[PDB]
Every structure is written in C-alpha cells, then in structure tokens.
Amino acid sequence: GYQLMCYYTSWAKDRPTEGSFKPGNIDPCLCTHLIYAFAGMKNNEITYLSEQDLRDYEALNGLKDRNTELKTLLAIGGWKFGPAPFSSMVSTPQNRQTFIKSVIRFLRQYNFDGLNLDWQYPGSRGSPPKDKHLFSVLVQEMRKAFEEESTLNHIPRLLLTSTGAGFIDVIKSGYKIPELSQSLDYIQVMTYDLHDPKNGYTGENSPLYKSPYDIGKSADLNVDSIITYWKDHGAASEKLIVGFPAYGHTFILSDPSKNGIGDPTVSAGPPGKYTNEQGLLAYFEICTFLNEGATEIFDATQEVPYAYLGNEWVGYDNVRSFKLKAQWLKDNNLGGAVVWPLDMDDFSGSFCHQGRFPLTTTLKRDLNVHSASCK
C-alpha cells in the first residue's frame, strides 16, 4: 500500500483559542504514521525540551491503543535547529555512538516506533562538505544499530527516516542518495516552501508542475521535477514520501490588479491570527481568508490554488490539489505522502466546513489507507 505520515508540532497546542490543537485529538485511524516535531539534542544525545513534550508523547502514543497498527516517529532537527548540532554529533565515531545509543534508549522508553532525522542541512548553511559523507555514515551506523537491537530483543526493528531537501543545489551538496536510500526506510522529500518572497514575485508553495515563467533553476521548483531528480539520482520510488503542505505562503502585491502567479511583490504577507508566522497561513486560516471574500483561482498549469484580497496574495493547497497530487504519486509508484503539519489542516472542521482534517482525509481516501484495527 501507501503510507500517509502526519506531523504534529509541539507548538500547535499553544496557538490561541480556536487555533489550539492537542495531539490526543488526532483521529487514530487517519494516518499510518504520526511524526512528533521536535526532539532536541544535549551533549550528543537526543532529548525532550519541556515536560509538556512528555505529556504530548503519552497522548500521541496512546492513539496506538485505538489503531494498533499506527506508528509514531520522533523527529529531530528542522530549519530553526540548523546544522551545527548535527555537524558536531557526526564529527567523531564516539559522538555518533553516544547519539545512536541515546536514540534507541529514548525511543524505546517513550514508546516511539522510529526516528526521523531532519538535518537542515548537511553540506550547507555552514555545515562543511565532509558532512555529506558523515551524514551517510551516521545513517548507516544508525540502521545497523537498529537491526542489532531488534535481533537482541526479538522485537520489530525501529524505523529510520530522513527528510530530503527539495532544492537541487542543497540535494547535491548534502545527500549521498544511493547510500541513503539503501539504509533508510523512507525519505520524506520536502516538496514545499518552493517560492520564497526574496525573488519579488508571487510563487506557489508546492506546485505539481512548473509555471511557464519558471526558467533556469526555477524550472525545478515543483513536485514533479524534485521527485524525478531524487529517482534519477538513485532513490527507491517506494521509499519516497512526498511532502504535502497543509499551509500556504503569503505575499504583498506591488499592484493589486497584477494578481497572478509570477506577478511583482513588495514583501511577505503578515502573520495570521492563529499561526503567527510572517509569510505563512495555515489551510484553516486560508479558509477564513476565502470566507472573507478573497478571489480564489485554481491554476491548472501548476495544479494548485491561489487567492487574493486587496494586496494580499496566498499560494497554497486545497482538496483538489491534494487529489491531483495523490493520483500523480500513485501513477509514479511512490511510497506515500507526509502532511506537513497535520495541525494546520482544519482539525476541528470549524474553519472550512469540509469535515475534520479535510486535506488529510482526502489523502487517506485516495491512497486507500487502512489498517486491520480501525474496522
């Protein structure tokens, strides 16, 4: 079958009033895997960062009592964390063993089924070129240690996944694709955040295909090109998990009458009421934007929507774009999808009136997600 992985972010519960979403309220039958963002690191060991995280782990893993086939993964890293803790940890065999041993202990004591590595990124952002090789060594050693622990304790092996960059230059400087594909269970490809406001033009967050004005390096800023790059450079199709964002990016239009894709912008758009991130809106916040009168366009060239009201423009994903991408990933024999983050889908059903988790429910249906337990 297909996997449907779903992130829960620790900060989702701290959004105000109706934006607050707690992990215990995830539907246990919606996803095949839940990924908790994030663990941190201390003295080359994985760790939690707040006692509240431990309450989240209890709630998240408690969902496995309702869907006994559900798996949980603990993610370490992310953009904000950056590369430096990973560079230090991979730099010596001793530090890698300290880390690997801590991961086995931590995942087993907190009832997680596996680890998601999310180093952003080996070989860039200050991480030296040697980290492309040392990341591959870390992943091989982690996979071997997981195999050994499974044999020792006669229990199913811990899963090992990694994020994979969506920008071709970052992929080249960071990832030994054939070796990583050998040792990882899955590669979660970060097919999102594809147009940043630095360029000064509106662009889609996760278009399936290129726009006619995407020239040169921009021609690869789409899901189809990125996944093709990973496969062309030796990744196993069935191990690739495509990133499906449950949010969009916002822009301020230079001219409110020039409101298409590729039109000039002034800056990123303002933070939303609930998510409070400059240049981003959750899908549930975009439903409000639409309800408040934004003009909604489905761009068939890129197979994604955008919407605008006054000088605010948002490029995002909706039920239709998720449906078209799900058909494309089945047609391309991919491993499945990861919803980043589940907590920005309309978890309550109150913002969009499309039922609970409308984006993710679309993927569950169209990827035929099921397990023995949920029947």
Author numbering: 0 to 374
Show the paper's wording.
Although mice do not encode Gal10 in their genome, they do form pseudo-CLCs, made from the chitinase-like proteins Ym1 and/or Ym2, encoded by Chil3 and Chil4 and made by myeloid and epithelial cells respectively. Ym1 (encoded by the Chil3 gene) and Ym2 (encoded by the Chil4 gene) are CLPs belonging to the glycoside hydrolase family 18 (GH18) and are unique to mice, with no known human orthologues. However, Ym1 is mainly expressed by macrophages, neutrophils and a subset of circulating pro-repair monocytes, while Ym2 is produced by lung epithelial cells, which could have discrete context dependent benefits. Ym1 and Ym2 are among the most strongly induced proteins in the airways of mice after allergen exposure and both proteins readily form pseudo-CLCs in vivo.
In parallel, we produced recombinant Ym1 and Ym2 protein in FreeStyle 293 F cells. Spontaneous crystallization was aided by low pH and low temperature (4 °C). Native in vivo isolated Ym1 crystals and recombinant Ym1 crystals as well as native in vivo isolated Ym2 crystals and recombinant Ym2 crystals were crystallographically equivalent, sharing the same monoclinic space group (P21) and unit-cell parameters. Thus, recombinant Ym1 and Ym2 protein crystals can be generated in vitro and are biosimilar to native Ym1 and Ym2 crystals. (C–E) Structural superposition of the X-ray structures determined from a native in vivo grown Ym1 crystal isolated from the BAL fluid of mev/mev mice (C+E) (yellow), a native in vivo grown Ym2 crystal isolated from the BAL fluid of a C57BL/6J-Tg(CAG-Gal10)Bla mouse (D+E) (blue) and a recombinant Ym1 (C) and Ym2 (D) crystal (grey). The low root-mean-square deviations (RMSDs) establish structural similarity. We showed that recombinant in vitro made Ym1 and Ym2 crystals were structurally similar to crystals isolated from mice and to each other, and when administered to the airways of mice, crystalline Ym1, but not soluble Ym1 protein stimulated innate and adaptive immunity and acted as an adjuvant for Th2 driven eosinophilic airway inflammation and immunoglobulin secretion.
